[PDB]
Amino acid sequence: ATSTKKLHKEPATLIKAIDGDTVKLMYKGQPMTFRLLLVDTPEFNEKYGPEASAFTKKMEENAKKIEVEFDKGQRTDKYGRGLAYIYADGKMVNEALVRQGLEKVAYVYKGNNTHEQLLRKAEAQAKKEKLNIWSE
Ligand SMILES: Cc1cn([C@H]2C[C@H](OP(=O)(O)O)[C@@H](COP(=O)(O)O)O2)c(=O)[nH]c1=O
Ligand SMILES: [Ca+2]
């Protein structure tokens, strides 16, 4: 097993919704592009990209409160995007995407794996429902 750590949620504000799994936030007083941990558009099914983007745009734009939760590993990727779990009024966007079959679990690195089993639980249930990306 990996080490484990207690993560915490930090304040941020929405600057702009980008797509399913990218969002631009004001974090510690500066704009920052964030990439959501542990999710991607399926390699072999991209039909739901627009719906995924619309979904997270609405969720992020309607939220009263956005929070960023970094994991225990790398805080930025090779492009200098933040890597985080993003919360909208306490709801984890990453988890919502997966439960709704709008993106799949992906980019699972041992370093930033704290909510892996949570998201896999959500995925297994979307897959059981043959929902959206899982429909064929
Ligand atoms: C989610 C995530 C993506 N990435 C990188 C892998 C991919 O690199 P490459 O660009 O070299 O393929 C890229 C995919 O991001 P996008 O899916 O936003 O394009 O982000 C990480 O390095 N760590 C992560 O945790
Ligand atoms: Ca994307």
mmCIF file of N, CA and C and ligand atoms in Angstrom:
data_model
loop_
_atom_site.group_PDB
_atom_site.id
_atom_site.type_symbol
_atom_site.label_atom_id
_atom_site.label_comp_id
_atom_site.label_asym_id
_atom_site.label_seq_id
_atom_site.Cartn_x
_atom_site.Cartn_y
_atom_site.Cartn_z
ATOM 1 N N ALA A 1 0.868 -1.230 0.000
ATOM 2 C CA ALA A 1 0.000 0.000 0.000
ATOM 3 C C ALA A 1 0.880 1.246 0.000
ATOM 4 N N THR A 2 0.329 2.324 -0.547
ATOM 5 C CA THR A 2 0.956 3.652 -0.486
ATOM 6 C C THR A 2 0.877 4.215 0.949
ATOM 7 N N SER A 3 1.721 5.201 1.232
ATOM 8 C CA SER A 3 1.482 6.042 2.387
ATOM 9 C C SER A 3 0.076 6.640 2.220
ATOM 10 N N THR A 4 -0.374 7.293 3.279
ATOM 11 C CA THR A 4 -1.645 7.979 3.274
ATOM 12 C C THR A 4 -1.400 9.270 3.996
ATOM 13 N N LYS A 5 -2.257 10.237 3.721
ATOM 14 C CA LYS A 5 -2.161 11.530 4.352
ATOM 15 C C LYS A 5 -3.541 12.138 4.460
ATOM 16 N N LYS A 6 -3.725 12.987 5.471
ATOM 17 C CA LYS A 6 -4.952 13.767 5.569
ATOM 18 C C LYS A 6 -4.866 14.989 4.684
ATOM 19 N N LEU A 7 -5.845 15.068 3.811
ATOM 20 C CA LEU A 7 -5.872 16.118 2.848
ATOM 21 C C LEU A 7 -6.751 17.196 3.461
ATOM 22 N N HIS A 8 -6.626 18.414 2.962
ATOM 23 C CA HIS A 8 -7.613 19.403 3.291
ATOM 24 C C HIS A 8 -8.043 20.278 2.151
ATOM 25 N N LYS A 9 -9.245 20.783 2.320
ATOM 26 C CA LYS A 9 -9.865 21.613 1.309
ATOM 27 C C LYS A 9 -9.463 23.049 1.555
ATOM 28 N N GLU A 10 -9.122 23.726 0.478
ATOM 29 C CA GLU A 10 -8.698 25.099 0.476
ATOM 30 C C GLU A 10 -9.681 25.905 -0.342
ATOM 31 N N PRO A 11 -9.754 27.175 -0.023
ATOM 32 C CA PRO A 11 -10.691 28.029 -0.734
ATOM 33 C C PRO A 11 -10.185 28.397 -2.090
ATOM 34 N N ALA A 12 -11.122 28.602 -2.984
ATOM 35 C CA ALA A 12 -10.805 29.088 -4.298
ATOM 36 C C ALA A 12 -12.077 29.703 -4.831
ATOM 37 N N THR A 13 -11.948 30.461 -5.903
ATOM 38 C CA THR A 13 -13.116 30.953 -6.627
ATOM 39 C C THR A 13 -13.032 30.687 -8.109
ATOM 40 N N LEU A 14 -14.185 30.455 -8.700
ATOM 41 C CA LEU A 14 -14.265 30.179 -10.130
ATOM 42 C C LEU A 14 -13.864 31.404 -10.938
ATOM 43 N N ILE A 15 -12.957 31.211 -11.876
ATOM 44 C CA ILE A 15 -12.718 32.210 -12.919
ATOM 45 C C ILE A 15 -13.391 31.818 -14.235
ATOM 46 N N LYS A 16 -13.126 30.612 -14.697
ATOM 47 C CA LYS A 16 -13.794 30.136 -15.868
ATOM 48 C C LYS A 16 -13.872 28.619 -15.932
ATOM 49 N N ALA A 17 -15.050 28.083 -16.271
ATOM 50 C CA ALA A 17 -15.177 26.674 -16.613
ATOM 51 C C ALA A 17 -14.485 26.402 -17.956
ATOM 52 N N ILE A 18 -13.745 25.301 -18.075
ATOM 53 C CA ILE A 18 -12.979 25.048 -19.298
ATOM 54 C C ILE A 18 -13.574 23.829 -19.986
ATOM 55 N N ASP A 19 -13.404 22.649 -19.395
ATOM 56 C CA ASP A 19 -14.070 21.443 -19.946
ATOM 57 C C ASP A 19 -14.379 20.479 -18.814
ATOM 58 N N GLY A 20 -14.741 19.247 -19.172
ATOM 59 C CA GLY A 20 -15.123 18.258 -18.156
ATOM 60 C C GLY A 20 -14.185 18.254 -16.958
ATOM 61 N N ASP A 21 -12.885 18.215 -17.238
ATOM 62 C CA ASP A 21 -11.919 17.929 -16.181
ATOM 63 C C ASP A 21 -10.811 18.985 -16.046
ATOM 64 N N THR A 22 -11.012 20.142 -16.653
ATOM 65 C CA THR A 22 -10.151 21.324 -16.426
ATOM 66 C C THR A 22 -11.048 22.466 -15.942
ATOM 67 N N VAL A 23 -10.548 23.271 -15.022
ATOM 68 C CA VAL A 23 -11.215 24.494 -14.574
ATOM 69 C C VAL A 23 -10.188 25.524 -14.196
ATOM 70 N N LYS A 24 -10.505 26.793 -14.429
ATOM 71 C CA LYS A 24 -9.623 27.880 -14.059
ATOM 72 C C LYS A 24 -10.150 28.560 -12.802
ATOM 73 N N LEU A 25 -9.312 28.622 -11.772
ATOM 74 C CA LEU A 25 -9.698 29.093 -10.449
ATOM 75 C C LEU A 25 -8.765 30.167 -9.986
ATOM 76 N N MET A 26 -9.296 31.035 -9.141
ATOM 77 C CA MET A 26 -8.457 31.952 -8.390
ATOM 78 C C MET A 26 -8.105 31.268 -7.094
ATOM 79 N N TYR A 27 -6.813 31.025 -6.893
ATOM 80 C CA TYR A 27 -6.349 30.219 -5.787
ATOM 81 C C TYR A 27 -5.179 31.024 -5.233
ATOM 82 N N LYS A 28 -5.228 31.276 -3.921
ATOM 83 C CA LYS A 28 -4.203 32.155 -3.294
ATOM 84 C C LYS A 28 -3.931 33.403 -4.100
ATOM 85 N N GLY A 29 -5.013 34.010 -4.560
ATOM 86 C CA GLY A 29 -4.953 35.303 -5.188
ATOM 87 C C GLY A 29 -4.425 35.368 -6.593
ATOM 88 N N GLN A 30 -4.207 34.208 -7.212
ATOM 89 C CA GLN A 30 -3.704 34.196 -8.589
ATOM 90 C C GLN A 30 -4.491 33.208 -9.426
ATOM 91 N N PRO A 31 -4.700 33.543 -10.693
ATOM 92 C CA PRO A 31 -5.382 32.549 -11.549
ATOM 93 C C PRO A 31 -4.532 31.301 -11.741
ATOM 94 N N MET A 32 -5.177 30.154 -11.782
ATOM 95 C CA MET A 32 -4.489 28.904 -11.937
ATOM 96 C C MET A 32 -5.395 27.941 -12.674
ATOM 97 N N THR A 33 -4.837 27.269 -13.678
ATOM 98 C CA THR A 33 -5.558 26.198 -14.335
ATOM 99 C C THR A 33 -5.393 24.929 -13.517
ATOM 100 N N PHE A 34 -6.510 24.304 -13.228
ATOM 101 C CA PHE A 34 -6.540 23.015 -12.508
ATOM 102 C C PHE A 34 -7.038 21.915 -13.438
ATOM 103 N N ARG A 35 -6.382 20.785 -13.300
ATOM 104 C CA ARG A 35 -6.777 19.525 -13.909
ATOM 105 C C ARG A 35 -7.265 18.617 -12.817
ATOM 106 N N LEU A 36 -8.459 18.101 -12.990
ATOM 107 C CA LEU A 36 -9.033 17.194 -12.005
ATOM 108 C C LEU A 36 -8.278 15.861 -11.953
ATOM 109 N N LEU A 37 -7.951 15.454 -10.745
ATOM 110 C CA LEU A 37 -7.339 14.136 -10.520
ATOM 111 C C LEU A 37 -8.233 12.987 -10.892
ATOM 112 N N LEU A 38 -7.588 11.959 -11.466
ATOM 113 C CA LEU A 38 -8.151 10.600 -11.522
ATOM 114 C C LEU A 38 -9.238 10.406 -12.545
ATOM 115 N N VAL A 39 -9.405 11.344 -13.461
ATOM 116 C CA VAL A 39 -10.474 11.207 -14.488
ATOM 117 C C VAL A 39 -9.982 11.510 -15.871
ATOM 118 N N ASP A 40 -10.621 10.930 -16.890
ATOM 119 C CA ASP A 40 -10.352 11.372 -18.245
ATOM 120 C C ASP A 40 -11.554 11.027 -19.094
ATOM 121 N N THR A 41 -11.634 11.682 -20.240
ATOM 122 C CA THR A 41 -12.489 11.186 -21.341
ATOM 123 C C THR A 41 -11.963 9.827 -21.794
ATOM 124 N N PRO A 42 -12.826 8.807 -21.921
ATOM 125 C CA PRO A 42 -12.353 7.528 -22.378
ATOM 126 C C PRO A 42 -11.586 7.520 -23.699
ATOM 127 N N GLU A 43 -10.474 6.765 -23.713
ATOM 128 C CA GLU A 43 -9.595 6.648 -24.881
ATOM 129 C C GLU A 43 -10.448 6.192 -26.004
ATOM 130 N N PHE A 44 -11.424 5.312 -25.733
ATOM 131 C CA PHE A 44 -12.153 4.643 -26.828
ATOM 132 C C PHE A 44 -13.620 5.053 -26.872
ATOM 133 N N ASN A 45 -13.952 6.131 -26.169
ATOM 134 C CA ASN A 45 -15.278 6.721 -26.316
ATOM 135 C C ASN A 45 -15.299 8.219 -25.929
ATOM 136 N N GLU A 46 -15.338 9.094 -26.934
ATOM 137 C CA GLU A 46 -15.270 10.518 -26.716
ATOM 138 C C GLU A 46 -16.650 11.225 -26.968
ATOM 139 N N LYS A 47 -17.718 10.451 -27.086
ATOM 140 C CA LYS A 47 -19.054 10.966 -27.465
ATOM 141 C C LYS A 47 -19.605 11.935 -26.408
ATOM 142 N N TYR A 48 -19.223 11.691 -25.174
ATOM 143 C CA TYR A 48 -19.747 12.414 -24.022
ATOM 144 C C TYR A 48 -18.886 13.605 -23.585
ATOM 145 N N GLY A 49 -17.844 13.919 -24.342
ATOM 146 C CA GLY A 49 -17.047 15.093 -23.967
ATOM 147 C C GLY A 49 -17.858 16.376 -23.814
ATOM 148 N N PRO A 50 -18.734 16.675 -24.788
ATOM 149 C CA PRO A 50 -19.480 17.923 -24.668
ATOM 150 C C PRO A 50 -20.405 17.881 -23.456
ATOM 151 N N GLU A 51 -21.077 16.761 -23.250
ATOM 152 C CA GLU A 51 -21.969 16.671 -22.099
ATOM 153 C C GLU A 51 -21.223 16.786 -20.768
ATOM 154 N N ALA A 52 -20.015 16.226 -20.710
ATOM 155 C CA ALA A 52 -19.203 16.286 -19.534
ATOM 156 C C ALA A 52 -18.817 17.759 -19.239
ATOM 157 N N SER A 53 -18.428 18.457 -20.281
ATOM 158 C CA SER A 53 -18.095 19.855 -20.132
ATOM 159 C C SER A 53 -19.279 20.646 -19.678
ATOM 160 N N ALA A 54 -20.461 20.423 -20.267
ATOM 161 C CA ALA A 54 -21.656 21.183 -19.864
ATOM 162 C C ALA A 54 -22.018 20.914 -18.426
ATOM 163 N N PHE A 55 -21.899 19.633 -18.028
ATOM 164 C CA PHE A 55 -22.192 19.229 -16.672
ATOM 165 C C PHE A 55 -21.335 19.916 -15.651
ATOM 166 N N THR A 56 -20.020 19.915 -15.864
ATOM 167 C CA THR A 56 -19.152 20.508 -14.871
ATOM 168 C C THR A 56 -19.220 22.053 -14.895
ATOM 169 N N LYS A 57 -19.474 22.632 -16.046
ATOM 170 C CA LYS A 57 -19.663 24.070 -16.162
ATOM 171 C C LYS A 57 -20.843 24.515 -15.286
ATOM 172 N N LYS A 58 -21.963 23.786 -15.402
ATOM 173 C CA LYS A 58 -23.129 24.138 -14.626
ATOM 174 C C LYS A 58 -22.812 23.950 -13.133
ATOM 175 N N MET A 59 -22.235 22.808 -12.799
ATOM 176 C CA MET A 59 -21.928 22.532 -11.390
ATOM 177 C C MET A 59 -20.992 23.594 -10.783
ATOM 178 N N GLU A 60 -19.952 23.946 -11.517
ATOM 179 C CA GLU A 60 -18.962 24.926 -11.042
ATOM 180 C C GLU A 60 -19.536 26.346 -11.000
ATOM 181 N N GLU A 61 -20.311 26.724 -12.010
ATOM 182 C CA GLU A 61 -20.843 28.073 -12.130
ATOM 183 C C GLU A 61 -21.948 28.318 -11.105
ATOM 184 N N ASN A 62 -22.732 27.287 -10.809
ATOM 185 C CA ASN A 62 -23.819 27.458 -9.825
ATOM 186 C C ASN A 62 -23.346 27.395 -8.407
ATOM 187 N N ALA A 63 -22.142 26.889 -8.162
ATOM 188 C CA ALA A 63 -21.708 26.667 -6.802
ATOM 189 C C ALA A 63 -21.524 27.980 -6.075
ATOM 190 N N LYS A 64 -21.942 27.999 -4.835
ATOM 191 C CA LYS A 64 -21.658 29.118 -3.932
ATOM 192 C C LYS A 64 -20.228 29.073 -3.497
ATOM 193 N N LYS A 65 -19.734 27.855 -3.286
ATOM 194 C CA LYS A 65 -18.390 27.644 -2.774
ATOM 195 C C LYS A 65 -17.641 26.591 -3.592
ATOM 196 N N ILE A 66 -16.492 26.978 -4.142
ATOM 197 C CA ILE A 66 -15.555 26.020 -4.698
ATOM 198 C C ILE A 66 -14.356 25.820 -3.768
ATOM 199 N N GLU A 67 -13.944 24.561 -3.611
ATOM 200 C CA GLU A 67 -12.775 24.220 -2.841
ATOM 201 C C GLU A 67 -11.821 23.327 -3.666
ATOM 202 N N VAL A 68 -10.519 23.498 -3.407
ATOM 203 C CA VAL A 68 -9.446 22.709 -3.953
ATOM 204 C C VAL A 68 -8.860 21.792 -2.869
ATOM 205 N N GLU A 69 -8.650 20.517 -3.229
ATOM 206 C CA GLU A 69 -8.017 19.594 -2.351
ATOM 207 C C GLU A 69 -6.861 18.938 -3.121
ATOM 208 N N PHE A 70 -5.641 19.344 -2.812
ATOM 209 C CA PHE A 70 -4.507 18.629 -3.353
ATOM 210 C C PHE A 70 -4.366 17.287 -2.661
ATOM 211 N N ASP A 71 -3.719 16.337 -3.339
ATOM 212 C CA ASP A 71 -3.433 15.032 -2.747
ATOM 213 C C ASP A 71 -2.013 15.087 -2.149
ATOM 214 N N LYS A 72 -1.516 13.949 -1.715
ATOM 215 C CA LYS A 72 -0.229 13.858 -1.051
ATOM 216 C C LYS A 72 1.010 13.885 -1.926
ATOM 217 N N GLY A 73 0.844 13.678 -3.223
ATOM 218 C CA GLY A 73 1.887 13.689 -4.224
ATOM 219 C C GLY A 73 2.116 15.026 -4.934
ATOM 220 N N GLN A 74 2.459 14.939 -6.205
ATOM 221 C CA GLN A 74 2.668 16.090 -7.121
ATOM 222 C C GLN A 74 1.506 17.024 -7.029
ATOM 223 N N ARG A 75 1.761 18.311 -6.841
ATOM 224 C CA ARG A 75 0.675 19.236 -6.841
ATOM 225 C C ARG A 75 0.404 19.842 -8.217
ATOM 226 N N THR A 76 1.388 19.792 -9.113
ATOM 227 C CA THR A 76 1.222 20.178 -10.492
ATOM 228 C C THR A 76 1.742 19.174 -11.462
ATOM 229 N N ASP A 77 1.163 19.174 -12.656
ATOM 230 C CA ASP A 77 1.632 18.267 -13.690
ATOM 231 C C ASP A 77 2.762 18.889 -14.512
ATOM 232 N N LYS A 78 3.134 18.209 -15.574
ATOM 233 C CA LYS A 78 4.250 18.644 -16.417
ATOM 234 C C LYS A 78 3.975 19.909 -17.159
ATOM 235 N N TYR A 79 2.717 20.341 -17.160
ATOM 236 C CA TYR A 79 2.346 21.592 -17.785
ATOM 237 C C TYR A 79 2.144 22.677 -16.765
ATOM 238 N N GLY A 80 2.436 22.396 -15.504
ATOM 239 C CA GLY A 80 2.173 23.331 -14.446
ATOM 240 C C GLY A 80 0.721 23.572 -14.129
ATOM 241 N N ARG A 81 -0.192 22.667 -14.517
ATOM 242 C CA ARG A 81 -1.547 22.724 -14.045
ATOM 243 C C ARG A 81 -1.638 22.161 -12.653
ATOM 244 N N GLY A 82 -2.465 22.735 -11.796
ATOM 245 C CA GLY A 82 -2.723 22.097 -10.510
ATOM 246 C C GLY A 82 -3.423 20.786 -10.644
ATOM 247 N N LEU A 83 -3.113 19.855 -9.772
ATOM 248 C CA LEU A 83 -3.764 18.540 -9.789
ATOM 249 C C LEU A 83 -4.519 18.441 -8.491
ATOM 250 N N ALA A 84 -5.830 18.401 -8.574
ATOM 251 C CA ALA A 84 -6.628 18.398 -7.375
ATOM 252 C C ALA A 84 -7.946 17.698 -7.503
ATOM 253 N N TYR A 85 -8.558 17.478 -6.345
ATOM 254 C CA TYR A 85 -9.963 17.169 -6.231
ATOM 255 C C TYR A 85 -10.682 18.502 -6.082
ATOM 256 N N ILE A 86 -11.714 18.729 -6.884
ATOM 257 C CA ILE A 86 -12.437 20.008 -6.908
ATOM 258 C C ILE A 86 -13.833 19.763 -6.326
ATOM 259 N N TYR A 87 -14.236 20.595 -5.352
ATOM 260 C CA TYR A 87 -15.523 20.487 -4.700
ATOM 261 C C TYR A 87 -16.368 21.698 -5.061
ATOM 262 N N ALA A 88 -17.643 21.445 -5.320
ATOM 263 C CA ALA A 88 -18.659 22.510 -5.599
ATOM 264 C C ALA A 88 -19.769 22.331 -4.595
ATOM 265 N N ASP A 89 -19.859 23.260 -3.652
ATOM 266 C CA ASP A 89 -20.784 23.127 -2.525
ATOM 267 C C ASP A 89 -20.715 21.733 -1.896
ATOM 268 N N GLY A 90 -19.493 21.265 -1.669
ATOM 269 C CA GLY A 90 -19.259 20.037 -0.944
ATOM 270 C C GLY A 90 -19.316 18.792 -1.776
ATOM 271 N N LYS A 91 -19.768 18.911 -3.027
ATOM 272 C CA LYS A 91 -19.835 17.794 -3.960
ATOM 273 C C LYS A 91 -18.548 17.690 -4.733
ATOM 274 N N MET A 92 -18.003 16.486 -4.823
ATOM 275 C CA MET A 92 -16.717 16.353 -5.528
ATOM 276 C C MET A 92 -16.992 16.240 -7.015
ATOM 277 N N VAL A 93 -16.539 17.197 -7.791
ATOM 278 C CA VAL A 93 -16.794 17.205 -9.240
ATOM 279 C C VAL A 93 -16.234 15.914 -9.837
ATOM 280 N N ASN A 94 -15.051 15.517 -9.407
ATOM 281 C CA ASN A 94 -14.386 14.344 -9.977
ATOM 282 C C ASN A 94 -15.307 13.095 -9.798
ATOM 283 N N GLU A 95 -15.861 12.957 -8.592
ATOM 284 C CA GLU A 95 -16.718 11.855 -8.261
ATOM 285 C C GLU A 95 -18.040 11.923 -9.070
ATOM 286 N N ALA A 96 -18.642 13.085 -9.145
ATOM 287 C CA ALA A 96 -19.850 13.267 -9.928
ATOM 288 C C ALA A 96 -19.686 12.886 -11.364
ATOM 289 N N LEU A 97 -18.613 13.331 -12.000
ATOM 290 C CA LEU A 97 -18.370 12.915 -13.367
ATOM 291 C C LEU A 97 -18.364 11.431 -13.500
ATOM 292 N N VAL A 98 -17.704 10.747 -12.569
ATOM 293 C CA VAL A 98 -17.546 9.315 -12.715
ATOM 294 C C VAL A 98 -18.894 8.587 -12.443
ATOM 295 N N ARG A 99 -19.605 8.985 -11.384
ATOM 296 C CA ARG A 99 -20.868 8.347 -11.084
ATOM 297 C C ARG A 99 -21.896 8.492 -12.218
ATOM 298 N N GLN A 100 -21.826 9.594 -12.960
ATOM 299 C CA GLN A 100 -22.738 9.869 -14.043
ATOM 300 C C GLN A 100 -22.277 9.300 -15.363
ATOM 301 N N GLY A 101 -21.172 8.540 -15.362
ATOM 302 C CA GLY A 101 -20.695 7.925 -16.599
ATOM 303 C C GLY A 101 -20.287 8.949 -17.606
ATOM 304 N N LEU A 102 -19.840 10.140 -17.144
ATOM 305 C CA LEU A 102 -19.415 11.179 -18.056
ATOM 306 C C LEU A 102 -17.908 11.225 -18.306
ATOM 307 N N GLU A 103 -17.124 10.771 -17.325
ATOM 308 C CA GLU A 103 -15.729 10.437 -17.541
ATOM 309 C C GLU A 103 -15.385 9.190 -16.768
ATOM 310 N N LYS A 104 -14.262 8.580 -17.122
ATOM 311 C CA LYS A 104 -13.839 7.335 -16.488
ATOM 312 C C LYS A 104 -12.688 7.608 -15.546
ATOM 313 N N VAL A 105 -12.442 6.665 -14.639
ATOM 314 C CA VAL A 105 -11.228 6.736 -13.832
ATOM 315 C C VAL A 105 -10.014 6.461 -14.697
ATOM 316 N N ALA A 106 -8.992 7.300 -14.554
ATOM 317 C CA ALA A 106 -7.811 7.290 -15.401
ATOM 318 C C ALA A 106 -6.677 8.030 -14.725
ATOM 319 N N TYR A 107 -5.491 7.966 -15.302
ATOM 320 C CA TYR A 107 -4.332 8.633 -14.715
ATOM 321 C C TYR A 107 -4.175 8.319 -13.254
ATOM 322 N N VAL A 108 -4.233 7.033 -12.945
ATOM 323 C CA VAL A 108 -4.159 6.642 -11.545
ATOM 324 C C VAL A 108 -2.700 6.442 -11.178
ATOM 325 N N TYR A 109 -2.124 7.450 -10.552
ATOM 326 C CA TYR A 109 -0.766 7.371 -10.039
ATOM 327 C C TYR A 109 -0.829 7.101 -8.546
ATOM 328 N N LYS A 110 0.072 6.235 -8.096
ATOM 329 C CA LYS A 110 0.154 5.878 -6.664
ATOM 330 C C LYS A 110 0.370 7.100 -5.818
ATOM 331 N N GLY A 111 1.093 8.072 -6.339
ATOM 332 C CA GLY A 111 1.346 9.314 -5.606
ATOM 333 C C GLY A 111 0.093 10.087 -5.203
ATOM 334 N N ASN A 112 -0.871 10.188 -6.097
ATOM 335 C CA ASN A 112 -2.087 10.982 -5.831
ATOM 336 C C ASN A 112 -3.257 10.057 -5.997
ATOM 337 N N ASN A 113 -3.429 9.147 -5.045
ATOM 338 C CA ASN A 113 -4.420 8.099 -5.132
ATOM 339 C C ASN A 113 -5.403 8.023 -3.977
ATOM 340 N N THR A 114 -5.522 9.103 -3.212
ATOM 341 C CA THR A 114 -6.296 9.039 -1.979
ATOM 342 C C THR A 114 -7.754 8.698 -2.227
ATOM 343 N N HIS A 115 -8.394 9.279 -3.240
ATOM 344 C CA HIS A 115 -9.795 8.972 -3.526
ATOM 345 C C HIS A 115 -9.980 7.959 -4.697
ATOM 346 N N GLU A 116 -8.984 7.136 -4.950
ATOM 347 C CA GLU A 116 -9.088 6.177 -6.047
ATOM 348 C C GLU A 116 -10.255 5.214 -5.783
ATOM 349 N N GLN A 117 -10.284 4.530 -4.618
ATOM 350 C CA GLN A 117 -11.341 3.531 -4.411
ATOM 351 C C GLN A 117 -12.748 4.151 -4.390
ATOM 352 N N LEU A 118 -12.866 5.373 -3.882
ATOM 353 C CA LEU A 118 -14.135 6.110 -3.933
ATOM 354 C C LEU A 118 -14.616 6.302 -5.363
ATOM 355 N N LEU A 119 -13.722 6.773 -6.224
ATOM 356 C CA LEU A 119 -14.078 6.950 -7.594
ATOM 357 C C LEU A 119 -14.301 5.647 -8.324
ATOM 358 N N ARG A 120 -13.523 4.610 -8.005
ATOM 359 C CA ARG A 120 -13.802 3.309 -8.603
ATOM 360 C C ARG A 120 -15.148 2.731 -8.218
ATOM 361 N N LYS A 121 -15.593 3.035 -7.015
ATOM 362 C CA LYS A 121 -16.914 2.606 -6.565
ATOM 363 C C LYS A 121 -17.996 3.270 -7.420
ATOM 364 N N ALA A 122 -17.819 4.541 -7.641
ATOM 365 C CA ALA A 122 -18.743 5.292 -8.476
ATOM 366 C C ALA A 122 -18.740 4.775 -9.906
ATOM 367 N N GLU A 123 -17.560 4.464 -10.419
ATOM 368 C CA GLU A 123 -17.448 3.952 -11.768
ATOM 369 C C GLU A 123 -18.135 2.613 -11.931
ATOM 370 N N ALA A 124 -17.932 1.729 -10.965
ATOM 371 C CA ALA A 124 -18.495 0.394 -11.068
ATOM 372 C C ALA A 124 -20.017 0.480 -11.144
ATOM 373 N N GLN A 125 -20.573 1.443 -10.455
ATOM 374 C CA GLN A 125 -22.022 1.600 -10.495
ATOM 375 C C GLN A 125 -22.540 2.241 -11.808
ATOM 376 N N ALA A 126 -21.820 3.217 -12.363
ATOM 377 C CA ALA A 126 -22.165 3.722 -13.674
ATOM 378 C C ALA A 126 -22.047 2.638 -14.766
ATOM 379 N N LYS A 127 -21.023 1.798 -14.645
ATOM 380 C CA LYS A 127 -20.768 0.716 -15.576
ATOM 381 C C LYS A 127 -21.868 -0.338 -15.462
ATOM 382 N N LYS A 128 -22.265 -0.629 -14.244
ATOM 383 C CA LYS A 128 -23.403 -1.525 -14.049
ATOM 384 C C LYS A 128 -24.679 -1.012 -14.695
ATOM 385 N N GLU A 129 -24.909 0.287 -14.601
ATOM 386 C CA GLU A 129 -26.077 0.944 -15.209
ATOM 387 C C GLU A 129 -25.980 1.178 -16.725
ATOM 388 N N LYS A 130 -24.823 0.812 -17.290
ATOM 389 C CA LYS A 130 -24.545 1.015 -18.678
ATOM 390 C C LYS A 130 -24.802 2.477 -19.010
ATOM 391 N N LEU A 131 -24.360 3.368 -18.132
ATOM 392 C CA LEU A 131 -24.691 4.794 -18.219
ATOM 393 C C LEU A 131 -23.680 5.591 -19.050
ATOM 394 N N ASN A 132 -24.199 6.254 -20.059
ATOM 395 C CA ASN A 132 -23.450 7.231 -20.833
ATOM 396 C C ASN A 132 -22.212 6.568 -21.458
ATOM 397 N N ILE A 133 -20.992 6.900 -21.042
ATOM 398 C CA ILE A 133 -19.834 6.256 -21.643
ATOM 399 C C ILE A 133 -19.877 4.711 -21.603
ATOM 400 N N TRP A 134 -20.661 4.168 -20.674
ATOM 401 C CA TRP A 134 -20.706 2.745 -20.467
ATOM 402 C C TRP A 134 -21.832 2.095 -21.207
ATOM 403 N N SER A 135 -22.489 2.848 -22.068
ATOM 404 C CA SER A 135 -23.710 2.367 -22.683
ATOM 405 C C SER A 135 -23.499 1.264 -23.711
ATOM 406 N N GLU A 136 -22.304 1.062 -24.244
ATOM 407 C CA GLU A 136 -22.142 -0.060 -25.205
ATOM 408 C C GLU A 136 -21.329 -1.225 -24.671
HETATM 409 C C1 LIG B 1 -4.820 13.810 -14.431
HETATM 410 C C2 LIG B 1 -3.340 13.881 -14.742
HETATM 411 C C3 LIG B 1 -2.887 14.151 -16.001
HETATM 412 N N1 LIG B 1 -1.523 14.275 -16.273
HETATM 413 C C4 LIG B 1 -1.027 14.508 -17.568
HETATM 414 C C5 LIG B 1 -0.937 13.189 -18.383
HETATM 415 C C6 LIG B 1 -1.228 13.650 -19.777
HETATM 416 O O1 LIG B 1 0.007 13.968 -20.436
HETATM 417 P P1 LIG B 1 0.158 14.109 -22.015
HETATM 418 O O2 LIG B 1 -0.430 15.489 -22.337
HETATM 419 O O3 LIG B 1 1.636 14.028 -22.249
HETATM 420 O O4 LIG B 1 -0.662 13.024 -22.671
HETATM 421 C C7 LIG B 1 -2.034 14.961 -19.622
HETATM 422 C C8 LIG B 1 -3.487 14.698 -20.013
HETATM 423 O O5 LIG B 1 -4.272 15.847 -19.764
HETATM 424 P P2 LIG B 1 -5.568 16.239 -20.574
HETATM 425 O O6 LIG B 1 -6.398 14.982 -20.492
HETATM 426 O O7 LIG B 1 -6.163 17.404 -19.779
HETATM 427 O O8 LIG B 1 -5.132 16.563 -21.995
HETATM 428 O O9 LIG B 1 -1.957 15.323 -18.233
HETATM 429 C C9 LIG B 1 -0.610 14.051 -15.206
HETATM 430 O O10 LIG B 1 0.632 14.127 -15.553
HETATM 431 N N2 LIG B 1 -1.004 13.735 -13.952
HETATM 432 C C10 LIG B 1 -2.364 13.602 -13.664
HETATM 433 O O11 LIG B 1 -2.678 13.290 -12.549
HETATM 434 CA CA CA B 2 -10.366 17.552 -20.625
#
